[PDB]
Design a protein around this ligand. Structure first.
Ligand SMILES: C[As](C)(=O)[O-]
Ligand SMILES: C[As](C)(=O)[O-]
Ligand SMILES: [Zn+2]
Ligand SMILES: [Zn+2]
Ligand SMILES: [Zn+2]
Ligand SMILES: [Zn+2]
Lengths: 316, 320
């Protein structure tokens, strides 16, 4: 109804505050952090880096983040719980599947995938009793046969629980179009769905058409500009506000503190390019929008009200 | 030299006894057993099935099994430890990488992979303190660039620690030949390598040439015969490869196993029920069916003991 499951337990809508809806503590692979923690220096070093990063975002106003790391991104909810407590920042955990499913997942039916997503929402993740509050899915432009099963399983899990769905897309391939078609074929309401990485395109008519159908538009790669400037990506926010779709916007950094599912030392490159980390949205994008004339009430609606409406489990 | 790592700690080689060198408690994926235990009914149901099966294997004479499940086969060494203690059967754990490495492994250099394998051999697996006693690798006929990195990392770890390497191959592709060439380019002795799934072929020329070089030949798919779609040979025809290799003078290069398991999520659903209804003996298939079949064919008892006890001991002893 109006309670959201976090890694520390359920919270009410009003407790969520300023929420970043697409983030990671650690981008990895299933089993990897526990099998090879020295890849990150140590588990303690990674935890301490994440706590400093969250404590800084908190000092910039952030009160909640949604960690959209799935099973196959190496989600370690025990890590999330530890860092959430030390930082005093709410963390919402995810179920779903990203782009690296192991064989034991790739060979499952849509019915089996539905049961796994439902277990993580309704019973808990692993043996921790921590329940997921969002379902994360991913496709690569043209949806593969397995990715279609994942999206349908995600829709069915969302329909049984009211928990929202958030996606990874290739925006340059207009990948949200095929995602939306599958979701609607399942009877999922677009207001339960965020089409993510949408700021990777300049095609405003693609974004507006999705927003016009009721989808949330995830503009979460603003600090990933590395030819368009981050200011140019951020102007997509103002463009959608001006078209009257302020209610459909979600904003985030898609940041992380460890990253093993990429080449070695990528985290050092990323941190040198965006030293603000997860504080980039509150420290840079929000003042940029206020200076371009966006009023405080609109910015509060995007960063507080929109994520509350999105994360609150709803079947209406 | 004479001590090997098991999931219960170090043992002397003389305590290994009758050893099955290619087995699995559970064939899965990294993280999967802990995230979705109800795929196997429950973690408790799976442990109890493994304990029952290992107990029947022990009654048939088995004293040690080598679980060649890697990280990416979802190896859960805490489960291996629990079932080894409850069945009172030695289990040797594995490091290495099989055919399903996640991105965090696929993107690593040969140097990084070497450190990972050395971590699991010299320090321990995850935070358990349990150390691997063997390195498992896998290729699919034509070795991929990343698979070549894994084989070179495995050879370097083996040279640093002395623990052996065992492989997954497509014997129909004669895959052991490309593996051996990579291993020998790293200076690894063939006596430290088992070429596995070798009973998937009839090509005695291919098998004897590897054995003549000092490689161990893993004949580990005998009870997989009656599983159709792949192969039409009976398990008796597969077992006669053991007799064939003995007759050519290569008894010291033979390792025999079941490649069985008690849970199997890295395959289509309900495969475990098909496998168990076809081979109800499970891991006891080798001691209960194959060994008497071979003794009937005139193979001396002391040759069979050499194959099931002596060859595994020489292979697993850290040597170098
Ligand atoms: C884990 As990602 C770089 O696809 O948001
Ligand atoms: C896990 As297997 C079927 O390659 O021995
Ligand atoms: Zn993504
Ligand atoms: Zn992400
Ligand atoms: Zn194999
Ligand atoms: Zn195997």
């Amino acid at each position: 109804g109006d309670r959201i499951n976090t890694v520390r337990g359920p919270i009410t809508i009003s407790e969520a505050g300023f929420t970043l809806t697409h983030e990671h503590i650690c981008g990895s692979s299933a089993g990897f952090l526990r099998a090879w923690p020295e890849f990150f220096g140590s588990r303690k070093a990674l935890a301490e880096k994440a706590v400093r990063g969250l404590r800084r975002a908190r000092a910039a106003g952030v009160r909640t983040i949604v960690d959209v790391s799935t099973f196959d991104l190496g989600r370690d909810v025990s890590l999330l719980a530890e860092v959430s407590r030390a930082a005093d920042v709410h963390i919402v955990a995810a179920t779903g599947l990203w782009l690296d499913p192991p064989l034991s997942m790739r060979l499952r039916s849509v019915e089996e995938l539905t049961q796994f997503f439902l277990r993580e929402i309704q019973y808990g993740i692993e043996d921790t009793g921590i329940r997921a509050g969002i379902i994360k899915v991913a496709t690569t432009g043209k949806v593969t046969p397995f990715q279609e099963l994942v999206l349908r399983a995600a829709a069915r899990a969302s329909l049984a629980t009211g928990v929202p769905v958030t996606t990874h897309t290739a925006a340059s391939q207009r990948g949200g179009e095929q995602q939306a078609a599958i979701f609607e074929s399942e009877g999922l309401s677009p207001s339960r769905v965020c089409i993510g990485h949408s700021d990777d395109t300049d095609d405003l008519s693609y974004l507006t058409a999705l927003a016009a159908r009721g989808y949330l538009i995830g503009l979460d790669h603003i600090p990933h500009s590395a030819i368009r400037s981050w200011q140019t990506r951020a102007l997509l926010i103002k463009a959608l506000i001006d078209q009257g779709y302020m209610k459909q916007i979600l904003v985030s950094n898609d940041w992380l503190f460890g990253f093993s599912s990429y080449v070695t030392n990528i985290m050092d490159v990323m941190d040198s390019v965006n030293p603000d980390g997860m504080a980039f949205i509150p420290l840079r994008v929000i003042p940029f929008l206020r200076e371009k004339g966006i009023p405080q009430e609109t910015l509060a609606g995007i960063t507080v009200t929109n994520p509350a409406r999105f994360l609150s489990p709803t079947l209406r």
